[PDB]
Ligand binder design. Structure first.
Ligand SMILES: Nc1ncnc2c1ncn2[C@@H]1O[C@H](COP(=O)(O)OP(=O)(O)OP(=O)(O)O)[C@@H](O)[C@H]1O
Ligand SMILES: [Ca+2]
Ligand SMILES: [Ca+2]
Ligand SMILES: [Ca+2]
Ligand SMILES: [Ca+2]
Ligand SMILES: [Mg+2]
Ligand SMILES: [Mg+2]
Lengths: 76, 986
């Protein structure tokens, strides 16, 4: 299938993944496009943050689904 | 034109041109309750032309649940007139007036109109006019844990910046005639299809460097297409591109026609199916109002709910909204209908406020067009929520009790918080806590700490402070300021000036923590957050975290024995340029600026310190060669700053300044070009100065050149400041000593280290006078200070940066940008700070409710610039199995008294089923079953504390209350296993 990952900076990234793909495997495809180490990646789907070890299907992420790639801020 | 001493921060997120539109925009705000006041507060601090209020209604006691500008005795008086007096006190540059009449024509005076606490019927009447005359219309409402914002900026509104981001930029390596632009060495361009870019400095295709934008077709992360361009050349080489932000028109529907086909902006893709329901409910809330004379459903009332529910079905069909009404959900809005939470007002306030700025600047993508939010998870479940418990009480907390109940209100009152930080977020936090009545009870108590003082620029995001407060402590001033908003806090707040960290552990010790209910961060640096986090985890206390960056902001809740801590996840470090890029091969203005800043520190700070240190520490000289990295630099800094070059007149300083010029903008350059010829080549036969390396060019002095002059003036003045000499400003004075200057010839030496003595150095230290000869003498080191102009600090750096800029043919930058980068300023404003504070408190109530289910907490992430909001459940602390029992790798620990080694060992084996094989404290090994029967026999009988002091050979400190230990042991199977730490409570 194909999913979309919109980031806090308004950027949209298109990925070619399978429902059985692992989150670790997704983070990497993202690292190849944006260059963000999987460790710093915060992917959220339908109010749930994705965790390594599980898979896209474990989050019911289906075709054409949209995820968010957010980050923590240092400013206060 | 624009006050950069105040709007400094906010200008980095909005921009000048953007604020000039604001200063010429009049805003109107209907309603002056929690929401309305919050909106105003921000709009005022924002810098619009003026603010106009309108709210005839009295001042019910319940209004004080979120209206921090209404006191106990203002009851009766029109909220409009009562608050206008304080909002005017916020931003001087912004006048605040009131109006008693609501004229349709009168509206054409304001660029934007905010509508709060108004019936739908009245709303239409207002939008119909506003929309037709092209007048920004915004409507919002806070109903308990529910909220809603609507926007209408005309059917032809134009946006000139849709994301707020800085126009991308990047160096090129090549570009085919087909339009195949290839980025530099592994450099990412970060462009999206449909983006436009212009070019500059591209050889092989001159007509390309004209400026005309070109649509981009991303072919990969390192390459993109712009279409065939063979009619401009055959192949371009190394250049630089720049993204062109193309505006776009956004067509808004009238509240009337949009009410039919509403366009939702989902703030949470997890509650995807709720906005529609809310669209109905909120209108039903309006209908019900008219029926009962503008009054809303009674708190947790069932009869009103039933009726309310009917109105839903009423408009559900008339609007022909084909949806399955969710009775339970919708009825919830009826119960909480009278709810007036301050957190909800802070959230929707900063949010709406930002929208107003958008409508008056055409900057950032607006909410189009329905924003229905809810934090239903906040609703308490550890107390009884009934029509009875949520009944009014005649106190300022009715608006809150209406949602959580009187029973719950007690818990909030008896809280013992600890706010770390008193800046932007700090103020908003206190404000919210005041309205919520935190620490108002008996055992309640707030503790605010911060080691910084108030500054002009701070008065833009930190409202609890005033200009006349500048120079005063934040924690202390904010504390007092809060006692006025809710007197019930007087004597309930303790302020501190201690910097939270390892040192302050004296004040914030075990006893201090064991009392706290929870901790909230309002910090500005990652290091501090980390420290607090660690402590909270050790003391098993909850922590509320939040951050901001311009329009972006984030929230994170860390609850004990449930979620992971703040430091459990990782964040990207600070981007620091390569030492050899700033030193010799800069290509971006940011490079020269960082360089300029080291130059500053290297000529007016580092050297001075060595002078004073030499006149204070006895064995300073000796201990230097033993530690100091560049003992040479040290010895020289003294020799030159004490005698070799000690000035005696500003005129003698101008000579020094002039010398520096050639030393860092001429000779240094020459020396480089000597080691690396302006056309020399590499081993691959490629031009050494190609791509990432711009060929420099020594600069000859010129008494009549802004940069050249600005540098001399700054440099000289600063050198003076060091020795204490009257700095001059009259230009003629410089010429009179510079025009008659003769610089010693410079010839680049052979054999110099450029990255891509035992007697000399020690002999020079003998040419220096003994500290004895200059007893009591000291120099004045220059402490960098971005926020000022009477110090020549930024003036220096700008010039120094723009001078090195000329060296490497790099485009210069005004002191506005230079200040931003040189001082590493964090762009930010009031809007974001408010949004986070709200979200933060919306979670705070979840902690006092004692919610144990993780799916109920939420971490926030948002970017006002694009109207993006997203939340996610917190990550669970990593668990682990030891002897079948599940343990928390983050929170569980073994609590034991100061027992004997033998005892502790027996304990683990008899009570935990663990055979302790190794015990340690820090880097010291206290015990190990594989040690000789001697070492053991002599220690086993000792008490832990005793054993520690012995092995450490350093007796414990009497200010300690705890003592952490690590252990290694085997489970019941004899197999090594990992267990929690041990906390000896001695
Ligand atoms: N380790 C710490 N312990 C306690 N307070 C801290 C610590 N580090 C930072 N702070 C304080 O946190 C507060 C909130 O930060 P904020 O960014 O709002 O303020 P600021 O640094 O004064 O603003 P600016 O950076 O624009 O000058 C500040 O007053 C700051 O001094
Ligand atoms: Ca982009
Ligand atoms: Ca001299
Ligand atoms: Ca446990
Ligand atoms: Ca155990
Ligand atoms: Mg400061
Ligand atoms: Mg700061």
């Amino acid at each position: 299938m194909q999913i979309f990952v919109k980031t806090l900076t308004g950027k949209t990234i298109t990925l070619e993944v399978e429902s059985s793909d692992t989150i670790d495997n997704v983070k990497s495809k993202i690292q190849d496009k944006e260059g963000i180490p999987p460790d710093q990646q915060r992917l959220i789907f339908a109010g749930k943050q994705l965790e390594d070890g599980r898979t896209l299907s474990d989050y019911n992420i289906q075709k054409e689904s949209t995820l968010h790639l957010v980050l923590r801020l240092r400013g206060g | 034109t624009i006050d950069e001493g105040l709007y400094s921060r906010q200008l980095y997120v909005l921009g000048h041109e953007a604020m000039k539109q604001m200063s010429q925009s009049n805003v109107l705000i209907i309603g002056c309750k929690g929401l309305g006041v919050e909106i105003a507060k921000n709009v005022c601090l924002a810098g619009v032309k003026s603010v106009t209020l309108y709210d005839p209604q009295p001042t019910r006691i319940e209004d004080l649940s979120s209206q921090y500008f209404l006191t106990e005795d203002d009851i009766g008086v029109p909220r409009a007139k009562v608050t206008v007096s304080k909002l005017a006190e916020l931003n001087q540059y912004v006048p605040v007036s009131v109006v008693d009449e609501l004229s349709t024509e009168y509206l054409k005076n304001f660029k934007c109109v905010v509508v709060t606490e108004t019936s739908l019927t009245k709303q239409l009447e207002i939008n119909d006019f506003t929309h037709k005359n092209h007048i920004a219309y915004i409507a919002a409402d806070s109903r308990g844990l529910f909220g809603s914002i609507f926007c209408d900026f005309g059917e032809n509104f134009i946006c000139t910046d849709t994301d707020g981001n800085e126009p991308l930029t990047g160096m090129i390596a090549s570009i085919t005639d087909d339009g195949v632009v290839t980025m530099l060495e592994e450099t990412r361009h970060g462009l999206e299809n449909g983006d436009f870019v212009k070019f500059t400095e591209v050889k092989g295709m001159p007509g390309l460097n004209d400026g005309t934008p070109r649509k981009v077709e991303v072919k990969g992360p390192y390459t993109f297409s712009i279409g065939s361009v063979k009619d401009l050349g055959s192949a371009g080489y190394n250049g630089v591109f720049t993204q062109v932000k193309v505006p776009t028109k956004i067509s808004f529907k009238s509240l009337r026609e949009s009410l039919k086909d509403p366009e939702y902006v989902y703030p949470d893709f997890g509650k995807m199916m709720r906005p529609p329901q809310y669209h109905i409910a909120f209108q039903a809330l309006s209908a019900f109002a008219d029926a009962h004379e503008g009054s809303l459903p009674r708190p947790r009332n069932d009869i009103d709910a039933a009726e309310f529910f009917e109105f839903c079905k009423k408009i559900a069909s008339t609007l022909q909204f084909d949806v399955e009404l969710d009775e339970k959900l919708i009825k919830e809005i009826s119960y909480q209908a009278r709810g007036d939470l301050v957190a909800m007002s802070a959230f929707l306030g900063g949010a709406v406020a930002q929208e107003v700025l958008k409508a008056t600047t055409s900057k950032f993508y607006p909410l189009k067009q329905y924003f229905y939010f809810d934090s239903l998870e906040s609703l308490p479940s550890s107390v009884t929520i009934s029509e009875e418990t949520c009944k009014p009480r005649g106190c300022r907390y009715d608006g809150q009790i209406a949602v959580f109940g009187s029973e719950f209100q007690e818990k909030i009152a008896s809280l013992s918080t600890f706010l770390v930080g008193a800046g932007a977020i700090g103020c908003e936090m206190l404000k919210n806590w005041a309205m919520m009545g935190v620490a108002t009870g008996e055992s309640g108590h707030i503790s605010v700490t911060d080691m910084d003082s108030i500054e002009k620029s701070n008065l833009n995001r930190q409202f609890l402070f005033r200009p006349r407060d500048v120079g005063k402590l934040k924690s202390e001033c904010a504390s007092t300021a809060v006692s006025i908003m809710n007197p019930s806090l007087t004597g309930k707040i303790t302020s501190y000036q201690e910097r939270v960290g390892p040192e302050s552990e004296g004040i914030f010790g075990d006893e201090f923590f064991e009392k706290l209910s929870l901790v909230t961060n309002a910090l500005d640096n990652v290091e501090a957050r980390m420290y607090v986090d660690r402590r909270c985890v050790f003391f098993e206390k909850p922590l509320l975290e939040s951050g901001t960056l311009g329009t972006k902001g984030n929230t994170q809740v860390v609850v004990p024995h449930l979620t992971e801590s703040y430091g459990s996840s990782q964040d990207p470090p600070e981007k620091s340029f390569p030492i050899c890029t700033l030193k010799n091969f800069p290509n971006r203005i940011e490079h020269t600026i960082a360089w300029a800043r080291d130059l500053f520190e290297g000529l007016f700070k580092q050297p001075i310190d060595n002078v004073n240190m030499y006149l204070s520490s006895p064995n300073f000289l000796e201990t230097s060669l033993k530690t100091s990295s560049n003992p040479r630099e040290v010895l020289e800094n003294i020799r030159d700053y004490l005698v070799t070059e000690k000035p005696l007149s500003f005129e003698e300083c101008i000579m020094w300044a002039r010398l520096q010029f050639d030393k860092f903008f001429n000779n240094n350059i020459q020396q480089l070009l000597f080691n690396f010829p302006k056309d020399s080549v590499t081993s691959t036969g490629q031009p050494f100065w190609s791509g990432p390396k711009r060929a420099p060019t020594p600069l000859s002095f010129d008494i009549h050149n802004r940069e050249h002059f600005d540098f001399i003036v700054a440099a000289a003045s600063l050198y003076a400041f060091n020795y204490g000499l009257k700095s001059e400003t009259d230009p003629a004075i410089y010429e009179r000593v510079l025009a008659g200057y003769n610089p010693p010839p410079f010839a680049p030496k052979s054999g110099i280290k450029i990255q891509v003595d035992k007697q000399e150095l020690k002999s020079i230290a003998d040419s220096l006078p003994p500290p004895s000869s200059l007893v009591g003498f000291r120099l004045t080191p220059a402490e960098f200070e971005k926020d000022d102009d009477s110090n020549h600090h930024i003036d220096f750096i700008t010039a120094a940066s723009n001078l090195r800029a000329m060296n490497y043919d790099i485009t210069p930058a005004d002191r506005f940008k230079t200040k931003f980068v040189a001082g590493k300023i964090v762009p930010a404003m009031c809007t974001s700070t408010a949004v986070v504070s709200g979200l933060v408190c919306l979670e705070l109530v979840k902690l006092v409710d004692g919610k144990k289910k993780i799916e109920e907490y939420k971490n926030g992430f948002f970017n006002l610039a694009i109207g993006l909001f997203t939340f996610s459940d917190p990550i669970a602390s990593p668990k682990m199995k030891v002897n079948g029992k599940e343990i928390d790798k983050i929170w569980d620990r073994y609590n034991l008294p100061d027992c004997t080694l033998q005892e502790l060992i027996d304990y683990f084996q008899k009570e935990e089923g663990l055979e302790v094989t190794m015990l340690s404290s820090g880097v010291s090994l206290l015990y190990a079953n594989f040690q000789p029967p001697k070492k053991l026999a002599e220690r086993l009988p000792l008490k832990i504390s005793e054993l520690v002091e012995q092995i450490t050979k350093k007796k414990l400190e009497p200010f300690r209350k705890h003592l952490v230990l690590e252990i290694c042991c085997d489970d019941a199977n004899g197999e090594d296993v990992e267990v929690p730490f041990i906390c000896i409570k001695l």
